[PDB]
Amino acid sequence: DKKWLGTPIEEMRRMPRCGIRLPLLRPSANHTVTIRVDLLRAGEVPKPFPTHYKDLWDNKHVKMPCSEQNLYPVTAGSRWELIQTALLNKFTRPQNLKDAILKYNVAYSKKWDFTALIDFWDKVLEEAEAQHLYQSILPDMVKIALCLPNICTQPIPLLAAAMNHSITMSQEQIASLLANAFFCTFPRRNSSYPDINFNRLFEGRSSRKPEKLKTLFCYFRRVTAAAPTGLVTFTRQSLEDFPEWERCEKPLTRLHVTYEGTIEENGQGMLQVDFANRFVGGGVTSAGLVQEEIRFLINPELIISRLFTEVLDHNECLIITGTEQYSEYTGYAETYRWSRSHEDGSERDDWQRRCTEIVAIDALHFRRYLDQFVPEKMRRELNKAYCGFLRPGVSSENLSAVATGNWGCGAFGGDARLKALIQILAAAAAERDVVYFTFGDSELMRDIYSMHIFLTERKLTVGDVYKLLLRYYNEECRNCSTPGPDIKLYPFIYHAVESC
Ligand SMILES: Cn1c(=O)c2c(ncn2C[C@@H](O)CN2CCOCC2)n(C)c1=O
């Protein structure tokens, strides 16, 4: 019968209800704000700040394709002028769009395959869907792309390694930038940063790329038909000191665990975990299509983080507040399909951001299963998840529950029962409740629940549970002969506590 166990989800904290009163939005040394805060009003398109385009071309800011420093050999010509000339043509067939993109990407004329674009346009879409694409959607995308200098007037700083910095920008500004990434206009981006240009989306056959493309065109059609009015904040968070996990005396927090539901639908207003690549968005602009790539597709404003977000180191995460959901889907990986356009129902905070907070935390990839029980590896995942959950200075009563699942399990070789407990300890140390989604795995739901209430009822601390993890390593893993250990973790823990 039971679809969920633990604390009712109804009892878990959510935004906007749990939220603090925001301070007044203003630019500071650690906060770039690219709109007129004095003019920000609900229901209105934000006005760019500053009024006129200003350009920075250096190793600390995005290199904009409209920069006068973006040049091409003729004698140097203006690549921006070349991009305008190339894109301001009728497209009536997919080859025309390919030829347009390649005019200002000449060096890539042999390297870049457009097969998936061609197949999408010619072999997947109806003839009428194809016509609307080239008569309406693509020309609207070109116009928003070419309005970049009027839209994104303020240089965008890179969120580089070890910076603690925020960028708050308009959904509209993001739309202009993404239209640019679609047409592959970002200069000098074709090694510590993810890909931003969409060229790999067009390559290969995969039955995946048609669905990706339908998802993204769903977005592009909405945002070029009617400008979104809200803001999005991107924050790199990078902590210096981590808890002494063996010494931590904090109690565990509440848990809700269910084998039904999704993070994005059932975890509304909660801190939603992106099971991320250390290059944020993973294979979204290429071949990947699991939890991260899906979220970045149905909430495409996430994709822009790849423009400015350097590869995460072990003490870092990215926190994105305000992204809007534009699509619904079914399936997963090879069965992923675009279903329909989604009308996002989320309330907006006082900064006109959708009350949707997503954190990218990258798990480690375990080639060998037992490697993850090594103390250094356990602490690594604890500290990564902790960094991702901690909101320094915010009271615990204003923290939403963490909405997560089997982080780093699947391709990355993570143990679901270990990672569940790791997230439970991280959350407790950050003083947040946990909402855990097992996606059909009803046994794992019982298991996590039973362990959680076992440790809670015996009032073990974070440190107590971590010491047990070390015991598991020392007795069952460190000198283990085989790929798998003699005794499984949860059974080991039960025996150890019931013995003592
Ligand atoms: C993280 N994640 C998933 O893993 C997922 C998902 N929809 C399906 N799956 C995959 C799991 O359902 C696969 N399990 C099935 C039951 O037990 C073994 C694997 N969704 C929507 C999701 O967000």
Phi, psi of 372 (to 5 degrees): -80, -15
Closest of 119, 302, 86, 133 to residue 201, by C-alpha? 119
Amino acid at 101: I
Contact between 384 and 42 under an 8 Å Cβ cutoff? The reply is no
The minimum-distance atom of ligand 1 relative to the CA of 294 is 23
H-type alpha helices, 349-488: 375-389, 416-430, 442-457, 462-472
Q: Which residues on adjacent β-strands are paired with residue 48?
A: 35
Contact between 289 and 421 under an 8 Å Cβ cutoff? The reply is no
Amino acid at 406: N
Asked if residue 242 has its Cβ within 6 Å of ligand 1, the reply is no
Contact between 370 and 474 under an 8 Å Cβ cutoff? The reply is no
Rounded to 10 degrees, the C-alpha dihedral 299/301/306/309 comes to -110
Rounded distance between C-alpha atoms, residue 440 and residue 3, angstroms: 10
Interacting residues of 168 by C-beta distance below 8 A, sequence separation 6+: 25, 31, 32, 33, 34, 35, 231, 232, 233, 234, 351
Catalogue the E-assigned strands of 223-284.
Answer: 231-238, 255-258, 271-276
Asked if residue 328 has its Cβ within 6 Å of ligand 1, the reply is no
Rounded distance between C-alpha atoms, residue 420 and residue 428, angstroms: 12
Polymer length of the chain: 500
Calculate the CA 488 to chain-centre distance.
Answer: 32
CB atoms within 10 A of CB 149: 18
Contact between 271 and 403 under an 8 Å Cβ cutoff? The reply is yes
CA distances from 277 to 31, 274, 362 (A): 25, 9, 5
CB atoms within 10 A of CB 467: 16
- 358: CA distance to ligand 1 center in Å? 19
Contact between 183 and 87 under an 8 Å Cβ cutoff? The reply is yes
Residue ID of nearest Cα to ligand 1 atom 23: 291
Q: Enumerate the known binding-site residues.
A: 263-264, 277, 291, 332, 406-411
Closest of 60, 102, 104 to residue 81, by C-alpha? 104
Interacting residues of 268 by C-beta distance below 8 A, sequence separation 6+: 14, 346, 356
Resolution in A: 2.0
Contact between 437 and 449 under an 8 Å Cβ cutoff? The reply is no
- 439: CA distance to ligand 1 center in Å? 4
Q: Enumerate the known binding-site residues for substrate.
A: 263-264, 277, 291, 332, 406-411
CA distances from 200 to 275, 276, 372 (A): 21, 19, 32
Method used to obtain the model = X-ray
CA distances from 65 to 49, 69, 186, 268, 381 (A): 19, 9, 5, 36, 38
393: left (phi over 0), alpha (psi -120 to 50) or beta: left
Interacting residues of 62 by C-beta distance below 8 A, sequence separation 6+: 155, 156, 157, 158, 186, 307, 308
Residue ID of nearest Cα to ligand 1 atom 1: 291
The minimum-distance atom of ligand 1 relative to the CA of 406 is 1
Q: Which residues on adjacent β-strands are paired with residue 271?
A: 357, 402
The minimum-distance atom of ligand 1 relative to the CA of 264 is 23
Rounded distance between C-alpha atoms, residue 227 and residue 175, angstroms: 9
Rounded distance between C-alpha atoms, residue 173 and residue 151, angstroms: 6
Rounded distance between C-alpha atoms, residue 41 and residue 223, angstroms: 19
Active site residues: 274, 292-293
Asked if residue 439 has its Cβ within 6 Å of ligand 1, the reply is yes
Burial class of residue 270, CB neighbours in 10 A (0-12, 13-18, 19+): buried
